[PDB]
């Protein structure tokens, strides 16, 4: 019917990249760099946030089936973004993605595209489509962040602060394998939960059930705090590794 696109954290110890001798830290770096490359290229081209995320999700899924040593990340990222453009109806010409990729990448990095950048990318489309098993439709945390925020009623300014902080967390989560661990609905809740703790807001008060302390259960059924905490920990670990502090 539909393919299964979620793995357990423990399973990431056995990606092709890991088994070819790449250590966990390096694959994480390669993922952040490849996701951020997709993000930066598409932002320069003026692409919708969904288009950037779809490319990134294709990218993250791809390296569950292939090794970073055999498929260069920057080529894959460009290919993903190219395909994402067509899937989400924000199309771009491959030559234009290459142009932008060259502007942003140094010469060593751009060496992955080889002697003919456009060709290396277009050829990978067959492998990409087969790898993602032709499941092109993707849902992202953004739509749920907004669907759920619309049902909150209260201080216009405290909620808008919650949404913008959470939206930032979603953008950061694209650099991680959370896209591969939890459905987008859970990600949207987790980022709302995270922002709430950081802003010291008590979200249940804004819901139709103000005495239901587990406010998220009305948006997403069957989600333990265990999960929302695991997700929060991962996002905050990115901020504790990098210099940048929580946005607040």
């Amino acid at each position: 019917t539909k393919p299964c696109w979620y793995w357990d954290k423990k399973d990431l110890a056995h990606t092709p990249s890991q088994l070819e001798g790449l250590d966990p830290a390096t694959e994480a770096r390669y993922r952040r760099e490849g996701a951020r490359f997709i993000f930066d290229v598409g932002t320069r081209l003026g692409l919708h946030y969904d288009t950037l995320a779809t490319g990134i999700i294709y990218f993250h899924r791809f390296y569950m089936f292939h090794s970073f040593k055999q498929f260069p990340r920057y080529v894959t990222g460009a290919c993903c973004l190219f395909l994402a453009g067509k899937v989400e109806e924000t199309p771009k010409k491959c030559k234009d993605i290459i142009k932008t990729a060259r502007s942003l990448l140094n010469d060593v990095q751009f060496g992955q595209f080889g002697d003919d950048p456009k060709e290396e990318v277009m050829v990978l489309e067959r492998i990409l489509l087969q790898t993602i098993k032709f499941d092109l439709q993707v849902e992202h945390p953004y739509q749920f962040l907004l669907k759920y925020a619309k049902q909150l009623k209260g201080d216009k300014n405290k909620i808008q602060k919650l949404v913008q902080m959470a939206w930032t967390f979603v953008n950061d989560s694209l650099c991680t394998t959370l896209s591969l661990q939890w459905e987008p609905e859970i990600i949207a809740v987790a980022v709302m939960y995270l922002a709430g703790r950081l802003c010291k807001f008590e979200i249940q008060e804004w819901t139709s059930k103000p005495m239901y302390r587990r406010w998220w259960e009305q948006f997403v059924q069957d989600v333990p705090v265990d999960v929302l905490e695991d997700i929060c920990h991962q996002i905050l670990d990115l901020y504790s590794q990098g210099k940048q502090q929580m946005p607040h």
Binding site: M122, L124, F134, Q137
Partner: protein, 325 residues
Amino acid sequence: TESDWGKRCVDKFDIIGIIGEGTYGQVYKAKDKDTGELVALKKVRLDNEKEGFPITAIREIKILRQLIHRSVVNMKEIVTDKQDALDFKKDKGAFYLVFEYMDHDLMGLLESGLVHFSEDHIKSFMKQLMEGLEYCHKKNFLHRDIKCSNILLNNSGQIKLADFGLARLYNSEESRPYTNKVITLWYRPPELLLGEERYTPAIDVWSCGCILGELFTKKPIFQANLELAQLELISRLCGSPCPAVWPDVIRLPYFNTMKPKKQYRRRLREEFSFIPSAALDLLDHMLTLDPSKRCTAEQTLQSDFLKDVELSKMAPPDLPHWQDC
């Protein structure tokens, strides 16, 4: 599993014939070697590689795997030509989109003229189409190319909509730029002739209304070659676009440009007086000039003509097969 598309080979299908020509490749009828069920195979060619995998196929793969309705064609799987190349650049093999085969198409049945459709058949036919369009319109997709050639019918009497090559998601809240001409001229709504660019789902309703009339006459209603001649034919029947009936006609790029010969009065009920009352009212509502006054797919289902139509016992199409020889 059944979800791993793009890996099974086309060796699994015995090819029977060339059923049709498509935009991204030609369509073939085939038989599944393992199950015997007859399928339809659309050949997607990425070898031209002007822009890689065709977007029209991507739309059809993205939308039809999301939409499951009795009246919308089922894409069963995608298969590859052959994995022999062994190198990605060397491989030029095409991909095939598998669909359930349909015995006939609406245009083919009418064009031969062998088939005469009773009111009860038309009720069964139109209820299925509008129920399917309701499913798509509720899921916020627009067909944008509804013609008789794209309405498939099997000998059982089930109707399915098929060509989603131009289908795109519609948002009412966010106004988005769109294509200026999408539907085939004969079935194109008047706003798109005047170049709305922000079209509503009521574009598909107008097409289905053109079909509703056609099923009662066996001849298309608005047959023209040029966009102006078409607006003239629509105007002779529905009345000329004017603010009196379409307050926002003035906001359209070609309203002042594409004036019809006269400011015609509406005669739709006169020229179609031979149609049953319940049906004629449906035609009048579907063929309304102002898309914001044109009925919705749901509203058609809640009509005297289609509401009480029980699809449990549907009349099969009388596609004759003896004495024609």
